[model samples]
Target: GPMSTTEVRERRRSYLTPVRDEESESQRKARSRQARQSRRSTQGVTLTDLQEAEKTIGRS
Candidate 1:
């Protein structure tokens, strides 16, 4: 049977909290990539633009 939304959320809450201790190396890297991709997708500015802006400000 398919889980309901509430059931899925409850499972995720428990699954995510205690599973990090058992996370493998590849899982860690995958999680980082997922987070970076999500951040880039949500933001209006690219990371390259931010880096260039920082360099320009530091040249003062």
Candidate 2:
């Protein structure tokens, strides 16, 4: 039998729901690591660090 799309939607709805928990420095480090990992998922273009604008994102 074909699964209803609503089932998948509900599963994702619950899974994506955010929950807060007490965290320590270790958790912060782990979250940073995961953030970096997820950032790598996107195609990287250029990394810009300038003294004038102080920040920017684009390819040279």
Candidate 3:
């Protein structure tokens, strides 16, 4: 089944809570690419944006 709205939002919040400062170059690029495709803005994305971004980034 597809993830519910709340399920998705909670996941993004969890993703945001972690410190990603140590990401490897390739890892950072992937994450950045995902973020860009998701939100198109690297600026702080709101929870709503996070939700939408998560949807755009899709699942693993």
The residue pairs that clash in candidate 3, if any, are none
> Which number leads on TM-score?
1
Question: Model 3 over residues 12-37: C-alpha lDDT tens digits?
Answer: 88874655654576698998788667
* lDDT (tens digit, per residue) of candidate 2 on 14-37: 863654443465698899778766
- For each candidate in turn, the TM-score is 0.34, 0.33, 0.28
- Give candidate 2 misplaced runs (Cα > 4 Å): 1-23, 45-60
Per-residue lDDT, model 1, residue 46, is 62
Q: Model-by-model lDDT, in order? A: 0.74, 0.60, 0.70
Off by over 4 Å in 3: 1-23, 41-60
For model 1, the stretches where C-alpha displacement exceeds 4 angstroms are: 1-23, 44-60
- lDDT, candidate 1, residue 59? 38
What 10-residue stretch in candidate 2 is worst by lDDT? 43-52
The true-versus-predicted C-alpha distance at residue 7 of model 3, in Å, is: 56
* Model 1, residue pairs in steric clash: none
* Residue pairs of candidate 2 with colliding backbone atoms: none
Give the TM-score (vs. native) of candidate 3.
Answer: 0.28
